[PDB]
Design a protein around this ligand. Structure first.
Ligand SMILES: [Ca+2]
Lengths: 263, 264
């Protein structure tokens, strides 16, 4: 029922004879590419996915023939191709909520002189779906970029608005992946959960990036799932007291307005 | 070796043991969703793809469990979901060639008071990789990853003109089947553009994509990205044919040459 966190891993999941393993694997290959690791061969993809290299070889050959990868003639290495951009825009275009939310986000971004964004979860990350900047505006586009769940304000609000058992399951995953730092990670999360219960937002005061503060408010939506709106920026421009006393309350009111306008 | 236009055709995996048919079929399902077709059920997807309904059912079930589709609990209909963006949307919106092209595109857009874009082909469409609007330009921006049809747009024509002889004919033979009724009307407009490219180095679309939009495009052959195409276009009353042929087109050719010399 919940979205798979680790689709290449067999676990306690009872068998699923409908599941199309080759489709899962080929899409996982595309997910190996990152801004720093943007050119990859079959060996690195096999090490990243844990798949046999001959299996990877069939998938990258197929992805090239379909236009989702391209292969450099000299090196043999692969890179993402622009079919992926077309798919992403088709996805973004079903977010009708943006026509109501974006003007309201720009008003808040202009007041706070900071970025306001809308995000949703995929696996253990939050993904930016729409970003507006204060009229004090860079070249890098941020739609589709990702933030970790536990330390960002958007991930904390997403976890806060989650059912208790589902949060526990995702948190198990994070805990078993970072055993050394988990007590510290969890304390930061516990504090954000108290803020959600007490005030209806979550903060990240330098806990995603040390120089950055942000506040976030979730919106549970029947079609889209849990959407999260945040406002954040340099901690010098947005000290904790400003987020608690001013921006956080404005963000709450903004989300109620969006929520009341969206069927 | 040319990118497949019809990957679900007969006998691919037979000629090519490396071809993973189930992966092709799932991506063909995801391609059914477009900016204007946002919600589809299994039967619409079977009709669009030609695949049997039980086959589509396995593919969509898989895509939902993975987070690439979502399913409405009451209606059973599907939509693309957030996991699609993790396949690489942000990285492709941030190609490093933008750091060379974008400021040059801004200068042209400011001068022309019109939008300047960078595009590349995917199957029978041109996909926008970057778009810059002139300072004080109040035309609605086309979005990153939006598409234009190949045959009637300036960007598609320039792409076809920069192609190898044979690849162009293969694509065009393919376009003659999708649209037999108006093909001689598509052929004539394309032959004009190919002639313009041979003679002058650009391609025009004077209202041949949308009636009140005119645009000029210039291709660039790049060793890594393939054929990139740059265009400059806008309201036809602002950009008459004469302005595009005498002023914008030549400036766009010089811009592409500058881009070409700065990214080796
Ligand atoms: Ca509502």
């Amino acid at each position: 029922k919940p979205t798979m966190l680790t689709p290449l891993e067999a676990g306690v999941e009872e068998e699923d004879r409908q599941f199309v393993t080759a489709l899962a694997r080929g899409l996982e290959v595309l997910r190996c590419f990152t801004p720093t690791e943007n050119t990859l061969g079959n060996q690195e993809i096999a090490h990243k996915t844990g798949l046999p290299k001959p299996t990877v070889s069939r998938l990258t050959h197929t992805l090239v023939r379909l236009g989702y990868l391209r292969q450099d003639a000299l090196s043999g290495l692969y890179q993402l191709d622009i079919g992926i951009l077309r798919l992403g825009y088709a996805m973004l275009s079903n977010l009708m909520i943006r026509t109501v939310a974006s003007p309201l986000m720009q008003v808040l971004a202009d007041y706070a002189k900071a970025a306001v964004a809308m995000a949703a979860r995929d696996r253990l990350s939050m993904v930016y779906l729409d970003v507006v900047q204060g009229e004090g505006n860079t070249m890098r586009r941020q739609i589709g970029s990702t933030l970790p769940l536990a330390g960002s304000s958007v991930g904390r609000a997403c976890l806060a608005a989650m059912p208790e058992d589902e949060r526990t399951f995702i948190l198990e995953h994070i805990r078993e992946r970072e055993p050394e730092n988990w007590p510290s990670i969890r304390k930061g999360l516990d504090r954000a959960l108290r803020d959600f219960e007490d005030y209806g937002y979550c903060l990240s005061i330098g806990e995603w990036h040390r120089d950055v503060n942000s506040v976030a408010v979730p919106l549970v939506h029947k079609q889209y799932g849990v959407l999260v709106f945040n406002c954040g920026g340099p901690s010098f421009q947005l000290p904790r007291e400003k987020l608690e006393d001013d921006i956080g309350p404005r963000l709450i009111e903004m989300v109620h307005n969006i929520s009341s306008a969206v069927p």
